[PDB]
Design a protein around this ligand. Structure first.
Ligand code: ADP
Ligand code: ADP
Ligand code: ADP
Ligand code: ADP
Ligand code: MG
Ligand code: MG
Ligand code: MG
Ligand code: MG
Ligand code: MG
Lengths: 434, 433, 97, 430, 442, 66
């Protein structure tokens, strides 16, 4: 019915209007300071004034860093663009790491436009060539409420010839982009043949020409790709043009600046509104120093959206550096522009509440005793393991027909499945490398 | 019905062979022994068959010669048709044309499929005769024919495109054909009287058609116009993440509308002990997505060094992945269980063994590795074929034993002759004197 | 053709018109010859490609025929109960406004 | 125009200077850094003079002290119409382009050229345009009426002119500008604008084109697309050798002029040794931009070699470059800088909060407090008061940790965090 | 007649259901080795087992490769055998894994046999046969078309359904031209004009083929064999002259692309469909990898999962080295260079060095294929030299001794000639001993 | 096809020795007819120490060419 993977029990940060964090809200227990400082960041993003600001959260495993970083994306809303990213993805064979890192900054800033498109539809009456050069064609499209004739470009005529349209077939033509679609043969010709493979559609209702406006939102990078490379079109020259250079290429700063300028000229008319976004990078400790040092210069730019980093480590050597040792696997020069949000580990009671709420969202009934066993488990092994054993216990309860989890079932699940500490103990004493 | 098949190591095992109570049987469905392992795998089997959960990882550990790879094979066999199952080696993700992370995501995309159903009408009936009207250099043509079935005899005029179809594949009065109206494709069941009887029922019937396509295919199709060729040619790279983010929303809408239902699959990875650290760091995050196929792994390596880092992690994987993953271990085989495995291998290869040859093969199979004793059983029949009788005798097993050397037996032979073999330093003695 | 027809959905939301003519270099003003661009235009006007289906499907998104019952909450459980009443040998009436 | 929200350097504009080159204490968003501003100003006037080319200068200093802001103030003080190129050291590394060609491409981008062309254009409102089909008497006969405020006359079209008017649909009553030499029509609006005067006027059109932009067009059929698409792909050196001579002849004829732009390289310490070896040869040539390089690190190992050279750069490159040193900021300058950022970000700070923010700025860093000044405004926004308060600065101090505090916390919590050896304890007890 | 270090090996040289002969097929000694391989030949001829690998180990110059060439001869020319080296797995175009999987599918072949009845010969005449139509009409109605056929030694007249007129019109044959007609499939094919018509025109651009030999009606069968990989390449590669995708085939370059598993399974489906009907026959082949010690651990790993495949063929390996560090892992040590997990899946065949008396027979047998004949006295030196210096040294000195014999005009090698050839060409040990006494950097 | 061949960016490729030999043949004929005159030229390399031992080894065979 409803698929749940390590999530969906968190509906947001759950902060009041004063900024105070409740003990329990939206699938969150404890971690009050991190939710408060996170909500401050939410309001900062809603303010839009700051740019190029970076905030990283450092905490142990299972402490809820990522789970808290999903709550801010839920709090911003679907209208604000969010770009989840992993530090291991910045390594690409086709393009260099630097271009892939700069691209995401352009993908993180959404820009919504509004534009009106013209639409023509009707049954075709006459088709004539006006024929060096491919001549135009006069089209006789017949609306239900009227009749109008229109001259067409030679290219859209080529698309028409490739669609095998004929006299008396309903077609659909887009004005701006020149797209051509055929709905089917008109319904009045259905009796011409007793057996035919072509379906019959009714005559389009209304006038030939129709208009409307769309609020459609397009990310800024998606707008940049349009200017950078050609895109699909019904003409052959379009397919050959896009098939000439399918491999992605690095964009120069000049084209980016010009696209930014036409974006400004679009915002001057009041047609569009530029809104920032959040770039989230998981496991920043996996980044090479070449990406960090480029993050030093890239965050100083004005168009750089707010970025959030997550790393769990002690004092460690930065990847790609020989003798450099810095906290959280991040260079000391980059850590200056970063603000830190610290995370704390949960106590026994908070683990018990976590397993409780996760059990309620998983839709499973747990008795008090087996729940206490799951808490003791969670204390003696890990927090993730107690949440992991929940489903197998329910499966064994399905095999025993019981509707609630029992101590015997969670004990049997302890016997059938092992955690890391037991498996390491089996690893220390073994015959050949178990 | 039958894919190309030869005798293989994982051949004999079909299905997991578990009771309704999920307790394992001593010998069932090709699997012998390994109780807690097969039961723990069956819990995962009914877990996937439930389909209400997502984004879970499990690990199957053990020493060499276990059947953890056989166990996962039994889970894939008991999984049945219509559930996608993808098994990739750990060294497969490395690619020159594609990024390791991109190919790792491409592995996650192939495991979960989508089923879409539709209804198409069908006309199936015998033909009485064919009448076509054409003109030499005269353009338009007019066809007509007469379809016949037991309860219905009617006459259908032919359209313009029906003519070309009927001329493409020869249609006769004797030939019985079945044609779809929307598809327009001509399907010939065979030949009637010059061997199938006239079709029963009405002439026109409507039957449902179901189409199943994996998420990866939908991902590649929408990237480029020629991107459909990347399906068969296998050449695609750096698929735009925005395309995936849009496909997830469209698929979610298809689920809410009830138009398309998704079938959760199982992802299996072999030899995970050697993998780059970026792959693990990507898996840790990637397992948390809404559509994450259930991941089961296999690691036969003990404590060793992870590739890409200098330090040695336990079990060969970083602790971050060991956390969310569950560990299902395996144990060695009893002396009798080895005999049972060798016997069922004889039944699968259809080779009759003598009792004394089975006891001797079991003893030399316990002293040495099991897979070696399973290797000799195939050659024993070929050696016994020259004796013109079909049996396996202790003499033939002894001859096969002296012909083919065990690894431990070759270790000594190398160590005494080391002057003859090429040393790591490069020195070798090729002269006897 | 069927799989391409059903499973092709997404469209390149952001495009720039007249970037196709400028990419190949054939346009009203360029360094290419005057007659060469015309001969190329005719050659492209003649030669046909099998990919026209993927092209026209990826350019404009098609509502097809299938969204009639999928855009209505009342039509989701309607055809289901019509199938249930069909297999049970019953007749039904429908009253509207 | 040019929508921008907030930048780190958004406040400082054009450094600051006097006719004596002596820097003012606070001039145009630039506080502190007396000697550095004077040397950077000498370099600026050296660029504006343009008598000398291909010289390298080095800007050295501690992190977050008077370094990038220098080159920013030099670029802004240099103003538009002169080229300025800023690239990171990691940006020149590319999989598709070699490091040497990608390094030369910037040297070609940093030098521009101005080309002037004279044209005769006729613009004005079109009241009446008549066009007639082919007849035996003449190929085509047509008359267009171009009306302007000072003069109104009628022209008889030239055949292919009629093909240009029929080629693009033209409606009577719109203001257009027809190009006689170019042969194309440009529509400036509708009659939105008013006719200025006489129809035909002789004007000159100046085009500023960099050496790179000239170089890419000749190596390709269409090179202007290769400019934007970045697919340029290692232009031949022979083509450039022709471009240089052709530019020399254009200069002797007087049809073009060159502008000695500036090339700024951030993070030069991370550049490979091969690039360092190429720069030495690239500086000694005829056409080269004035190069400014800034490195935070010093006495470190050069990438590509085992030994550690001083300052992180090879001495052969240090010979070609002049070194400028920056000094750490005093306590009295930090408060003025934070006040400038307060005026830039529309943030009102009390003197009592400015004292604490200055003390924290001296104890830890300037970049930190300048990050906090932005965060405290929202905590003050929840209290609905317009001005920030001391309590809000303390709350913003406890909520977001510093680096030095986070290290001291990690050292105590090291058992919880992952270690270089990969050891971590996620279990609370035992 | 070219001979390179081989061609004196003919098969394994076994006998019927027994122990291998002492000397057969140019093989001397090592009866146990070529016997054990003799059983492997039967295992391969069984065409049952899959993914079963074996490894023959031993010192250099022990005859490791000659055994693989021998079993390659024993299988026959129809059984596919792919020679391959471990160094060939590394390619810049595609990953090593895809190349290994491709070579794994290059081994298994597939045979197709087809029998089709044909009608060929000249055209004596063509006449229609008019009959009444089922529904009355004024126009003409043809029931059948009569076609005569003339060939050497025979003549025949045929009657066809009237639908043949479309195919005859397509082929444009009229009279006096040899045609090609298939019985059940039908239509026509025009091979070329008859030979007797070349004289009527002094100059013509059409060739004239002679009349078909034998009867006008024939039945023949043709067997065609194609490997599964060569089949897959045709499926993955587009084919057309003028097509737009094919137009992009030109002006661009083709490069090896990783083939998806879906396509391979799809080919397996139709191959199985044709093998069920009896028209197709699947014969597994043999893969051979020389110097397995050169393989990286990433390929050794993929062999573990690859050998457990169902269609995987029999692959024979050769590793001369002893205990070594596996490529890719510095600390790991395993015999022969093969990891122990991979050693667990195969069978080891030992090889032993050749005796002195066996060496002399090696040289004397090589002399026959070399066509050079040597005395008994000069042969005894080649034996001792072969045992001291090396085996391949005495075999290498054969041709220079013959050329020097031709310079001395003698037809047989002499002791003076083998000594003079000894002084001119030095073996490895002498050179390595000279390098130590020279400070010239030699 | 040639149009798209002009559109594609020039990509360096390894030139075969045969084509170079043919060019040396036609030039060797034109210098015999007296229509052409070949002149040598000077190559200059700076920081030769940055070269790999591979290029240093190929320089040995390159300098022995005519
Ligand atoms: N405060 C919390 N309330 C409820 N669940 C939590 C909380 N903190 C962490 N979790 C749970 O812990 C699981 C794993 O935490 P995660 O954020 O992945 O740790 P890390 O940030 O170290 O990767 C998540 O699925 C999340 O549901
Ligand atoms: N329970 C079992 N039932 C049948 N065969 C088994 C079983 N366990 C192991 N085997 C045998 O072990 C062989 C392969 O072992 P495998 O699991 O591949 O070793 P590894 O764990 O090193 O991969 C198979 O041929 C299979 O027949
Ligand atoms: N002289 C100055 N006047 C005003 N602000 C300065 C000055 N020097 C540095 N800054 C501040 O320092 C910040 C960036 O420091 P930066 O010069 O980039 O250090 P570095 O170049 O060593 O990384 C800017 O936000 C700027 O406000
Ligand atoms: N039984 C044999 N009789 C004669 N010559 C043999 C025999 N076995 C091997 N040789 C010789 O050995 C050579 C091949 O040696 P090879 O197996 O390649 O050495 P390695 O074991 O190092 O690969 C052949 O040239 C052949 O003349
Ligand atoms: Mg995380
Ligand atoms: Mg395994
Ligand atoms: Mg800096
Ligand atoms: Mg110099
Ligand atoms: Mg060999």
């Amino acid at each position: 019915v409803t698929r749940t993977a390590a999530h969906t029990h968190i509906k947001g940060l759950g902060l009041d209007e004063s900024g105070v964090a409740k003990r329990v809200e939206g699938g969150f227990v404890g971690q009050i300071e991190a939710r408060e400082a996170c909500g401050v960041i939410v309001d900062l993003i809603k303010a839009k004034k700051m740019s190029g600001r970076a905030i990283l959260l450092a905490g142990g495993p299972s402490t809820g860093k990522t789970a808290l970083a999903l709550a801010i994306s839920q709090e911003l809303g679907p209208k604000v663009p969010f770009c989840p990213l992993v530090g291991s993805e910045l390594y690409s064979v086709e393009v260099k790491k630097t271009e892939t890192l700069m691209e995401n900054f352009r993908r993180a800033i959404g820009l919504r436009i509004k534009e009106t498109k013209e639409v023509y539809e009707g049954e075709v009456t006459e088709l004539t060539p006006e024929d060096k050069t491919i001549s135009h064609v006069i089209v006789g499209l017949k609306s239900a409420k009227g009749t109008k004739t229109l001259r067409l470009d030679p290219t859209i005529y080529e698309s028409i010839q490739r669609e095998k349209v004929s006299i008396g077939d309903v077609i659909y033509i887009e004005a701006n982009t020149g797209a051509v679609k055929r709905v089917g043969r008109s319904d009045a010709y259905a009796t011409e043949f007793d057996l035919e493979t072509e379906e019959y559609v009714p005559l389009p209702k209304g006038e030939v020409h129709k208009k409307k406006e769309i609020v459609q939102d397009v990310t800024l990078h998606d707008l940049d790709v349009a200017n950078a490379r050609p895109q699909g079109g019904q003409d052959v020259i379009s397919m050959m043009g896009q098939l000439l250079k399918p491999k992605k290429t690095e964009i120069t700063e000049k084209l980016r600046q010009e696209v930014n300028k036409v974006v400004a000229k679009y915002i001057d008319q009041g047609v569009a509104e530029l809104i920032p976004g959040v770039l989230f990078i998981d496991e920043v400790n996996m980044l090479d120093i070449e990406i960090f040092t480029y993050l030093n210069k890239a965050l100083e730019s004005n168009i750089a959206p707010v970025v959030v980093l997550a790393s769990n480590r002690g004092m460690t050597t930065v990847r790609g550096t020989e003798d450099v040792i810095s906290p959280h696997g991040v260079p000391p020069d980059l850590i200056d522009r970063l603000l830190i949000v610290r995370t704390l580990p949960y106590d026994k009671d908070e683990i018990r509440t976590i397993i409780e709420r996760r059990a309620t969202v998983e839709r499973l009934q747990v008795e008090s005793s087996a729940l206490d066993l799951l808490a003791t488990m969670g204390t003696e092994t890990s927090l993730r393991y107690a949440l992991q054993l929940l489903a197998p216990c329910g499966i064994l309860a399905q095999t025993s027909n019981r509707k609630e989890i029992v101590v015997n079932d969670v004990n049997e699940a302890k016997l059938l499945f092992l955690d890391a500490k037991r498996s390491t103990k089996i690893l220390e004493t073994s015959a050949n490398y178990l | 019905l039958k894919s190309l098949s030869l005798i293989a190591a994982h051949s004999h095992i079909t299905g997991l062979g578990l009771d309704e109570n999920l307790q394992p049987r001593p010998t069932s469905e090709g699997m012998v022994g390994q109780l807690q392992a097969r039961r723990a795998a069956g819990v995962i089997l009914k877990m996937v068959q439930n389909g209400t959960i997502a984004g879970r990882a499990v690990l199957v550990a053990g020493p060499p010669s276990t059947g953890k790879t056989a166990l996962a094979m039994g889970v894939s066999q008991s999984l049945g048709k219509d559930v996608p199952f993808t098994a990739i080696a750990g060294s497969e993700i490395f690619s020159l044309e594609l990024s390791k992370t991109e190919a790792l995501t491409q592995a996650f995309r192939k495991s979960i499929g989508i089923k879409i159903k539709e209804e198409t009408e069908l006309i199936e009936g015998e033909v009485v005769e064919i009448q076509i009207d054409r003109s030499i250099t005269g353009g338009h043509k007019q066809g007509k024919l007469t379809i016949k079935t037991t309860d219905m005899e009617t006459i259908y005029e032919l359209g313009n495109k029906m003519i070309d179809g009927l001329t493409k594949e020869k249609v006769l009065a004797g030939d019985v054909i079945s044609i779809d109206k929307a598809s327009g494709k001509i399907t010939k069941l065979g030949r009637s009287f010059a061997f199938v009887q006239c079709p029963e029922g009405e002439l026109q019937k409507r039957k449902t058609v179901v189409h199943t396509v994996s998420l990866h295919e939908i991902d590649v199709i929408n990237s480029r116009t020629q991107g459909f060729l990347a399906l068969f040619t296998g050449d695609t790279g750096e698929i735009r993440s925005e395309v995936r983010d849009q496909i997830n929303t469209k698929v979610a809408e298809w689920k809410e509308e009830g138009k398309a239902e998704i079938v959760p699959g199982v992802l299996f990875i072999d030899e995970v002990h050697m993998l780059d650290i970026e792959c693990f760091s990507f898996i840790n995050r990637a397992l948390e997505d809404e559509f994450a196929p259930i991941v089961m792994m296999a690691t036969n390596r003990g404590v060793s060094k992870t590739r890409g880092t200098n330090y040695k992690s336990p079990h060969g994987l970083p602790l971050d992945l060991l956390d969310r993953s569950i560990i299902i271990t395996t144990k060695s085989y009893n002396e009798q269980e080895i005999k049972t495995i060798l016997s069922i291998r004889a039944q699968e290869e259809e080779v009759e063994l003598s009792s004394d040859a089975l006891d001797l093969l079991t003893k030399t199979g316990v002293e040495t590795s099991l897979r070696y004793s399973s290797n000799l059983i195939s050659v024993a029949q070929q050696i016994a074929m020259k004796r013109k009788n079909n049996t396996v005798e202790v003499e033939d097993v002894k001859r096969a034993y002296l012909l083919f050397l065990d690894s431990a037996r070759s270790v000594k032979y190398v160590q005494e002759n080391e002057s003859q073999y090429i040393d790591d330093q490069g020195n070798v003695q090729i002269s006897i004197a | 053709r069927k799989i391409i027809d059903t499973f092709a959905v997404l469209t390149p939301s952001a495009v720039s018109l007249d970037m196709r003519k400028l990419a190949l270099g054939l346009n009203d003003d360029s360094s290419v010859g005057e007659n060469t661009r015309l001969k190329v235009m005719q050659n492209c006007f003649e030669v046909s490609n099998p990919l026209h289906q993927l092209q026209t499907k990826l350019t404009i998104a098609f509502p097809d025929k299938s969204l009639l019952q999928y855009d209505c909450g009342k039509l989701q459980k309607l055809a289901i109960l019509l199938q249930q009443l069909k297999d049970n040998g019953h007749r039904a009436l429908i009253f509207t406004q």
